[PDB]
Each structure stands twice: as structure tokens, then as C-alpha cells.
Amino acid sequence: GSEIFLASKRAAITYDTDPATGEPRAWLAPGGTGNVVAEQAGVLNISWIASADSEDDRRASALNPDGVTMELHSGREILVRLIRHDPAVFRNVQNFMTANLMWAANNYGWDRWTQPSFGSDAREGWADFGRFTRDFADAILKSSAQSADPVYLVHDYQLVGVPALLREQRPDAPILLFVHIPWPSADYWRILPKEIRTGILHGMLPATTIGFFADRWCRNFLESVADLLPDARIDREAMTVEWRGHRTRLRTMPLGYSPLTLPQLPEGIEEWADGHRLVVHSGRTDPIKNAERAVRAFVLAARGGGLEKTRMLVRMNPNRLYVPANADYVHRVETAVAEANAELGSDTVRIDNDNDVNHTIACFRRADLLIFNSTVDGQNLSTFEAPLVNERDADVILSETCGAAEVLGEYCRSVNPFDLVEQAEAISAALAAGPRQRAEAAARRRDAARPWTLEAWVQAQLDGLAADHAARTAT
Amino acid sequence: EIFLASKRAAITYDTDPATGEPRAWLAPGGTGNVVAEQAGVLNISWIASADSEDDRRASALNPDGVTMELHSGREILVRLIRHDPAVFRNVQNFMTANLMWAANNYGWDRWTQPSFGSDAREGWADFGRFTRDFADAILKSSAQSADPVYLVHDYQLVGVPALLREQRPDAPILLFVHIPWPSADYWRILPKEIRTGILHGMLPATTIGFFADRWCRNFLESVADLLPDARIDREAMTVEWRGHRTRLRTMPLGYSPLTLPQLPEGIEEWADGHRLVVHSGRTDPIKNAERAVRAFVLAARGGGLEKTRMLVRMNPNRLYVPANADYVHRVETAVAEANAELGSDTVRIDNDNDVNHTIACFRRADLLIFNSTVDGQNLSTFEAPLVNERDADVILSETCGAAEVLGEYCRSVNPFDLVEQAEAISAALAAGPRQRAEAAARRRDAARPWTLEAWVQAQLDGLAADHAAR
Ligand SMILES: [Mg+2]
Ligand SMILES: [Mg+2]
Ligand SMILES: [Mg+2]
Ligand SMILES: [Mg+2]
Ligand SMILES: [Mg+2]
Ligand SMILES: [Mg+2]
Ligand SMILES: [Mg+2]
Ligand SMILES: [Mg+2]
Numbered sequence: 001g002s003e004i005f006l007a008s009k010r011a012a013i014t015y016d017t018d019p020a021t022g023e024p025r026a027w028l029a030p031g032g033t034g035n036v037v038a039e040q041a042g043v044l045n046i047s048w049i050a051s052a053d054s055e056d057d058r059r060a061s062a063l064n065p066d067g068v069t070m071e072l073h074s075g076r077e078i079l080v081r082l083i084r085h086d087p088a089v090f091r092n093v094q095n096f097m098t099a100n101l102m103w104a105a106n107n108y109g110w111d112r113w114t115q116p117s118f119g120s121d122a123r124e125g126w127a128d129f130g131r132f133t134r135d136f137a138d139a140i141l142k143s144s145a146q147s148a149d150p151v152y153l154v155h156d157y158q159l160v161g162v163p164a165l166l167r168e169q170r171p172d173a174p175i176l177l178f179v180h181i182p183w184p185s186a187d188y189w190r191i192l193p194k195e196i197r198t199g200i201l202h203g204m205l206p207a208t209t210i211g212f213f214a215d216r217w218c219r220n221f222l223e224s225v226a227d228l229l230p231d232a233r234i235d236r237e238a239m240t241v242e243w244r245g246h247r248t249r250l251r252t253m254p255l256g257y258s259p260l261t262l263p264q265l266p267e268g269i270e271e272w273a274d275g276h277r278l279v280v281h282s283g284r285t286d287p288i289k290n291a292e293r294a295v296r297a298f299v300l301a302a303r304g305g306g307l308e309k310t311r312m313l314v315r316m317n318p319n320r321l322y323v324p325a326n327a328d329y330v331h332r333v334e335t336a337v338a339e340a341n342a343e344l345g346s347d348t349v350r351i352d353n354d355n356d357v358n359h360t361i362a363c364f365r366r367a368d369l370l371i372f373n374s375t376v377d378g379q380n381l382s383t384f385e386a387p388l389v390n391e392r393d394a395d396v397i398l399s400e401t402c403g404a405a406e407v408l409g410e411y412c413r414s415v416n417p418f419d420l421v422e423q424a425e426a427i428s429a430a431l432a433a434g435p436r437q438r439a440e441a442a443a444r445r446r447d448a449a450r451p452w453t454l455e456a457w458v459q460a461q462l463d464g465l466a467a468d469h470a471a472r473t474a475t
Numbered sequence: 476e477i478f479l480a481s482k483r484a485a486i487t488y489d490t491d492p493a494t495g496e497p498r499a500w501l502a503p504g505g506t507g508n509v510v511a512e513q514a515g516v517l518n519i520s521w522i523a524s525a526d527s528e529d530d531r532r533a534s535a536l537n538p539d540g541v542t543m544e545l546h547s548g549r550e551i552l553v554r555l556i557r558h559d560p561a562v563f564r565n566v567q568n569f570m571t572a573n574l575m576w577a578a579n580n581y582g583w584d585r586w587t588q589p590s591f592g593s594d595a596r597e598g599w600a601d602f603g604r605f606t607r608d609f610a611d612a613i614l615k616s617s618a619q620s621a622d623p624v625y626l627v628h629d630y631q632l633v634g635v636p637a638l639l640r641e642q643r644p645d646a647p648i649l650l651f652v653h654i655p656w657p658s659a660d661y662w663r664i665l666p667k668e669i670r671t672g673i674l675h676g677m678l679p680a681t682t683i684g685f686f687a688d689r690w691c692r693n694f695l696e697s698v699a700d701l702l703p704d705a706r707i708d709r710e711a712m713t714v715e716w717r718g719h720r721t722r723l724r725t726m727p728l729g730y731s732p733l734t735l736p737q738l739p740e741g742i743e744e745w746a747d748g749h750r751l752v753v754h755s756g757r758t759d760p761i762k763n764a765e766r767a768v769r770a771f772v773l774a775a776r777g778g779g780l781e782k783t784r785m786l787v788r789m790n791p792n793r794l795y796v797p798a799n800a801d802y803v804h805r806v807e808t809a810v811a812e813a814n815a816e817l818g819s820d821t822v823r824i825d826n827d828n829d830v831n832h833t834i835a836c837f838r839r840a841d842l843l844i845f846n847s848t849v850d851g852q853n854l855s856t857f858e859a860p861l862v863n864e865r866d867a868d869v870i871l872s873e874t875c876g877a878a879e880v881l882g883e884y885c886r887s888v889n890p891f892d893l894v895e896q897a898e899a900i901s902a903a904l905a906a907g908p909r910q911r912a913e914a915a916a917r918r919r920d921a922a923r924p925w926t927l928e929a930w931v932q933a934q935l936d937g938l939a940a941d942h943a944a945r
Contacts, residue, residue, distance in 0.1 A: 421666070
């Protein structure tokens with residue numbers, strides 16, 4: 001008897017002609033939070049509320065106020081309702097400063113000794129955060145104006161301010177906030193300026209349920225609350241916060257993959273890899289993906305002997321390259337690859353860069369060894385998808401700091417992503433292992449990965465939120 | 476019989492001006508002076524590392540111990556361990572902002588550093604040898620003792636308790652760490668054999684002490700995270716592991732009354748007619764002088780600081796460590812940029828290890844800034860208000876151990892937020908004599924009880940209770 005409203009900020013939508021119909025088409029770039037949320041919209045048969053961040057988006061939204069019919073990579077179709085944030089007030093929706101600070105904080109990118117140093121920009125950014133949060137919350141509230149019993153599913157870190165605003169207007173509504181990124185240790189969270197470190201928590205706590213992909217993130221969130229909000233009472237065993245009349249439950253809801261989204265190799269790759277064992281590292285152009293260290297670990301593994309007919313493919317998916325840290329990462333990866341080739345012989349290691357899902361899947365299929373060695377990762381879905389499609393009983397080296405390691409770590413070669421020697425030794429061992437050992441390990445790994453579907457995760461959201469809503473009422 | 480050990484002893488060997496005989500004296504400040512003063516308090520020898528040929532010569536020539544003069548005036552015996560020089564050199568590298576200093580004092584960005592190679596494997600091996608040298612020295616000194624008590628000080632000796640416990644199953648062993656303990660997620664940046672091996676080395680202690688509750692909490696979380704076989708109790712502050720029961724204790728330290736002069740050359744004249752902001756600390760990136768200078772510039776831009784100057788007092792220490800050299804460069808850069816904007820000679824750097832100069836700067840200050848990025852405790856934030864003659868406000872980082880005792884009596888700041896720090900500089904200097912007078916008196920009252928002798932008593936009392944429980 002409830003209507004469900006699902007929102008997230010980022011929607012990477014292209015507009016082109018549909019070859020099937022010859023009509024103008026909206027389609028969603030693959031990967032990122034957007035693809036996950038869009039698939040959830042499809043599972044639930046509801047619209048996806050997200051931000052218009054271009055004239056094209058505004059134009060599409062104005063012509064289709066009921067929503068734009070959008071095509072997923074999985075071929076599936078949903079309605080997307082893009083919020084037409086006023087272009088004169090919100091000049092650049094694509095990049096919000098406060099959200100970018102939260103990205104760096106939550107993914108641990110600062111050394112503290114030299115960075116960060118917050119100036120007036122952080123104050124201005126926080127004011128802008130407030131304006132955007134209000135504009136977004138108002139759009140959700142307008143969308144749900146004809147609903148007597150709305151259920152709000154608010155997705156990802158850009159919307160951390162939203163639950164407080166929804167709770168103010170809809171005191172009895174079930175509200176889930178689901179964060180797709182890590183939550184950092186209390187000492188690290190409090191690097192942020194006082195108004196932001198506390199303000200964000202004030203924005204989140206009015207949610208019925210706060211979800212993360214991993215237990216570690218829930219624990220770190222609770223510790224952050226205990227550290228900063230003298231008014232709050234945490235219960236580490238119950239995973240609860242009680243604060244200013246808000247009761248909040250923290251839940252872990254792991255996600256692995258979408259079965260319905262699971263081709264030929266990129267140009268030149270099949271011939272280059274022929275007769276060689278192939279090590280594959282795959283991920284976005286983001287320093288957390290840790291390809292530089294993966295390449296250096298490969299070089300150290302080769303130094304120990306036994307990798308004579310082995311090559312390494314670094315698959316990088318271009319994304320937000322305008323961010324200085326991302327550009328720096330690509331530079332550092334290119335440098336390590338050049339050093340590897342200088343040391344091991346030309347063409348031992350190759351970078352292959354695009355956002356083509358078919359190429360990604362092909363590379364997952366061809367791999368003799370898969371490396372997902374993130375410095376940290378909210379979850380990392382590639383580490384579920386890859387073994388599920390791999391045909392060669394490839395081993396998987398998985399960083400212990402990926403959310404996914406809580407589910408898959410015991411079925412992979414779990415590593416410290418900062419230790420090049422451990423990683424080199426894991427690379428050597430994985431490639432030395434005989435086919436029967438690898439076959440049995442891969443079968444167990446597929447069995448461990450298989451249950452963690454997008455639909456199961458959506459069900460977890462609803463089951464958790466429903467239970468927490470009941471508990472909130474009883475208290 | 477109490478046995479006391481710590482690694483670092485910065486000793487100078489010269490001729491005693493009063494007697495003409497050979498003399499050994501200990502550098503003031505740092506952990507060495509603290510442990511040396513504790514040896515004096517307890518009337519015991521201090522076991523420490525010989526770190527140079529002169530130390531080895533002195534140790535070899537005086538096997539009973541080297542009579543060593545402390546800055547406070549006192550005299551104690553130091554028993555210096557002659558390690559293998561190659562092992563020692565590499566271990567000292569392991570203990571600097573390479574490796575362990577960055578691990579416990581939060582110096583890594585994770586995205587680009589660290590990346591552990593074979594050097595970390597060799598470093599760990601050498602650390603084991605160094606640890607064995609210390610345990611053998613301590614055991615040798617205590618071998619005929621029926622009921623020895625072991626007080627093992629600071630992070631370099633984290634491996635020692637396990638080795639002592641192996642030989643002395645029933646002995647009281649305190650491990651007291653003088654630096655922070657990092658969050659669990661940060662601790663596990665270290666290679667597996669190190670992150671776990673260090674915990675295995677520490678947990679056999681009867682008692683593990685830190686200067687702050689936060690460090691104890693972070694330690695427990697690290698144990699819970701890495702040792703599936705350990706059981707922690709956050710309320711009892713205990714670890715139960717392999718039938719070892721370990722108690723975690725917070726034992727704050729503030730200052731030594733006995734250690735509490737003229738200003739350095741040129742400073743008095745330069746400061747005359749001006750309000751003086753003083754930042755003081757070792758050449759270590761945790762001391763955060765660069766951000767303090769930038770915050771000062773931001774405050775000066777706002778007006779109201781027209782007759783205000785800033786003194787950056789830096790105590791040269793291990794300038795060969797890249798992170799320390801970089802820190803000094805960044806501070807020099809910020810000071811030059813401050814002067815280029817605000818006017819020549821607005822900000823000065825003054826560098827030496829003269830305690831008298833430090834105390835004098837504390838006395839002269841109209842505002843004191845101890846804005847460390849993190850600090851195991853920071854003793855300067857107790858010493859400075861207790862000697863200051865201006866009722867200077869204190870800007871104190873919330874990330875100093877000392878903030879747990881003095882935070883509410885100072886202007887507590889986020890050390891990464893320049894605007895907050897600038898606003899605190901401005902507010903601190905907007906208040907004249909009387910406003911500050913009341914707060915300054917309450918601050919001194921808060922700082923006063925936290926003496927060195929009280930802290931030594933806390934060590935003994937805590938250890939005794941924990942030993943009787945185990
Ligand atoms: Mg758009
Ligand atoms: Mg931390
Ligand atoms: Mg985890
Ligand atoms: Mg890659
Ligand atoms: Mg010496
Ligand atoms: Mg040392
Ligand atoms: Mg951390
Ligand atoms: Mg210092």
C-alpha cells in the first residue's frame with residue numbers, strides 16, 4: 001500500500017538515435033552507482049529520480065515531465081526523472097565541492113602531514129551543499145506529493161543531507177540512505193572541517209536505516225557518530241544510534257553483480273596474449289583501483305622467476321580524468337608500465353583503455369589471473385562478475401580492503417594492497433598452481449559469488465527498511 | 476628490583492667544566508629525557524641503545540654504567556647496549572618516518588604511499604635481532620632477581636614484552652608507548668608479518684599504557700581486527716588472547732616541575748612593541764608549523780593584527796629523514812610567502828635545541844600554538860601555560876593526547892582547518908588582560924597535577940593491580 005521513491009545524484013545519460021526504432025534514445029553509460037540504481041528502478045518497476053546536469057538533460061526532462069524512457073546496458077527499460085536544477089543558481093551540478101571532499105575523506109586519499117588544508121573554499125562549498133541538498137530533497141517531496149505513504153530510498157554519498165530534510169516534512173516515512181562508498185575510521189572522518197564532519201552526520205541520522213556494503217563501514221560510521229556527537233548514544237552490538245529523538249539502524253547489505261548483465265577482445269589483444277598466461281587488472285581511472293602497485297608487484301613476481309611466458313593487461317575505464325588525482329594515477333600507471341617493459345622486455349605489459357562492457361567481459365574471460373587489489377573499495381563488483389564469467393579457472397587476487405572481501409576474501413588470494421612483496425608472491429603462487437587446484441578453487445569461488453545478486457540486494461533493502469521502520473515505531 | 480629500558484639516548488661526551496673529568500650529558504626534551512628522569516625518580520639504572528662509536532666506547536669502558544648528567548641537574552647510570560652497527564642503522568631507519576613513525580603518526584595517503592618491498596622484510600628481520608638484544612640485556616641485568624619488575628618504554632621496544640614473558644612467565648611487565656596508536660584500518664596498512672608480529676610482541680605485557688584514551692581504543696580495535704583469536708572488552712579495557720590477559724591503561728603526563736632564561740639572540744628586540752604568536756616544536760611533520768603560518772596569514776588579512784609578529788621555533792631533530800627535510804622546506808616556504816604578503820620580518824624561524832631558549836619563548840608569548848596534526852601527548856602544552864607571563868591563550872589541536880586533559884581549557888582546533896585556526900588566532904588576540912586572566916588561571920590549574928612523578932606512580936600502581944589480577 002506504499003509508493004516507493006528512488007533517488008541518486010549521478011546519471012551519465014547520452015542522447016542518440018535508437019537503431020531499433022529510429023526514435024531519439026536515452027541510454028545510460030555502463031558502471032558506476034548510476035547503473036546499479038537504474039537496475040534497481042527496473043527490479044522495482046519505479047522511476048529513477050536523478051540530477052539533470054546539462055542543457056540536454058533539462059531539455060529532455062522538460063519535454064518528458066512524466067520521465068524519459070531510458071535504455072540500460074542490460075537492454076531493460078525504466079523511466080528516469082531528471083531534476084531540472086536551475087542553471088543560473090546551480091551553474092555546475094556535475095561537480096559539487098563538498099561531495100568531492102567526502103570522496104577523498106571516505107576513500108582515504110589524504111596523508112594528513114601535507115594535505116588537506118581547508119580554506120574559505122570549504123565554507124563556500126558547504127553553503128552550496130546545503131542549497132543543492134534542499135533543491136534535491138524538494139524535488140523528491142514534489143515527486144511524492146500524491147503519496148500518502150511514501151517510502152524513500154536515497155542512494156549514495158552525494159545525498160547524505162537528504163534524509164534530514166525528508167524526515168522534517170514526512171516524519172513517519174520509511175527512509176533508507178544507502179551509501180556505496182566506504183566510511184572511514186573516526187580519526188580520519190574528523191579531518192573534515194567541524195561544520196561538515198558534524199553537518200553530514202546530522203543529515204544522515206534522521207534516516208530509518210543507513211546501509212553500507214560492508215560491516216567495516218557500518219562500524220566506522222558508528223565510531224564517527226560516537227566521537228563527534230556528544231548527544232548521540234551508539235550501541236555497537238545492536239548497530240544502532242539514538243540521537244535527538246531519531247533512532248537509526250545501521251545495516252550491511254552486500255551486492256555482487258547483476259546476472260542479466262553477464263564478446264570479443266579489444267583490438268590486438270587476442271594475438272598479443274596468444275600462447276601467454278595473461279594477468280588482468282581492471283578498473284576505472286581512479287587511484288583507489290591501485291593499478292600502479294599491481295604492475296610493480298607483477299615486475300617483482302617476474303624477478304623471482306617462473307613468469308617467462310606471462311603478460312599483463314591493465315584495463316582502465318576512463319572516468320573523471322579532469323580530477324587531478326585521477327590524471328596523476330593514469331600518469332603513475334603509464335610510468336610503471338614503461339618501467340616494467342624496460343625491465344622485462346617490450347610488450348610484456350599493455351594498457352587498454354575504454355568503457356566498452358563487452359571488452360571488459362572478454363578480458364575477464366581471457367584472464368589466467370585476475371587482480372582486484374584496490375587500496376580501498378566500497379564494494380568492488382568486478383570481483384564477483386569476473387570469476388563468474390571466467391572460463392580458465394583464473395585465480396583472483398583481492399584486496400582485503402574491498403567491501404567484497406567480507407564475502408569473497410576466503411575464496412580468493414586476499415592481500416594487503418600496500419605490500420608489493422605479498423602481492424608479488426601471490427601473483428607467483430597463483431600462476432604456479434596446477435589446473436586441478438585452480439579448478440576446485442574457482443568452483444568454490446563461483447559458488448560464494450553467485451548468491452549476491454542485484455535483486456537479492458534490492459530485497460535486502462526492503463526487508464531491512466521494513467524491519468527498522470517497525471522497530472522505530474515500537475520505540 | 477625495577478628494570479627500565481628505552482631505545483633513544485642522545486648523549487654528548489665532553490669535559491666537565493667544573494671537575495675537568497670526562498662527562499656524559501643527556502639532551503633535554505624528547506622521550507629520552509622523560510625516561511631518564513623516571514630512572515632518577517626510581518633510583519635505578521636506565522638500559523638504552525648505544526647509537527654511535529662514542530656511546531660504544533663509553534659503554535665498553537664503563538661496564539657498570541655511564542654516569543650521566545641530566546638537564547635538571549640530576550645524575551643517573553645509563554647501561555648502553557652495544558648492538559651490531561649494521562642491524563642498528565637499519566632498525567633506526569625502520570623507526571623513522573620511513574616505516575614506524577609514519578605508521579603510528581598518520582603520515583601516509585594510501586593512494587600513493589606506502590609501497591612495501593623487500594626492504595620491509597629485511598627491516599623486520601633486523602628489528603627481531605634488535606628486539607632480542609634488548610630482551611637479552613634486560614634479562615641479563617635481572618638474572619639473579621627473584622621478583623624483577625620490567626618497565627619497557629616506547630614504540631621501538633614493542634617486541635620486547637613477548638621475549639621477557641618467555642623467560643619470566645610470572646613477572647610484572649609494563650609496556651608504555653609514548654606515541655599515538657592508529658585506527659585499525661590505518662594500522663593494517665603495515666605488512667602482515669609486521670602488523671601482527673608487533674601485536675604478538677606487545678600482548679604478553681601485563682599492562683600496556685598510552686598517554687590518551689583514544690590510543691588505547693585504537694589499540695583494542697587493531698587487536699580485534701587482526702587477531703581473530705583475541706577477545707577485547709572495550710569497557711574493561713582488556714585483551715584476552717592465548718590465555719594472556721592484558722590491561723590497557725591511559726596514564727597522562729604533563730611536565731616535570733624541575734625542568735621549569737634569556738630569549739635567543741635578536742628575538743627580544745625584534746619582538747619589542749609587538750604581540751608575539753609562538754609556535755614551538757621539533758622538526759617533525761606532526762608539529763604542523765606550515766599550517767600554523769598559513770593560518771596566521773589568514774588572520775592577518777582580516778585586520779586587527781597590525782602590531783603582531785610570529786615566531787616559529789623549531790628544534791632540529793633528524794633532518795636527514797626525508798619527511799623532516801620536506802617539512803622544514805614547507806615551513807620555510809610559508810614563512811617567506813607570509814613576509815612577501817604581510818611585510819618583511821613579520822614571521823621568523825628560530826632553530827636550536829636550547830631548552831632555556833624554549834622556556835623564554837614560552838614566557839614571552841602573547842599567544843601559544845600547539846596545533847599538531849597528531850601527537851602522542853605534547854608536553855609543551857602543559858609547560859608553556861605554566862611558565863607564561865602574559866596569560867597567553869593556547870591554541871591546541873584536538874588530535875594531541877593532551878587535549879583529553881586540557882582541551883576544554885584551551886582553544887581546541889581541527890589542525891587541518893586553516894580558517895578555524897585563523898579565527899582562533901584572531902579571537903585569542905581580541906581579548907586583553909582580564910578575559911584571558913581567568914581562563915589562563917583555570918588552564919594552569921588543569922595542567923598542574925600532571926607531573927612526571929605522578930605519572931611514574933600511575934605506572935607502578937596500574938602495573939601492580941594488573942599483575943595481581945594476572
Ligand atoms: Mg547529464
Ligand atoms: Mg585514521
Ligand atoms: Mg572489511
Ligand atoms: Mg586498471
Ligand atoms: Mg648518542
Ligand atoms: Mg628511534
Ligand atoms: Mg583509517
Ligand atoms: Mg617537540
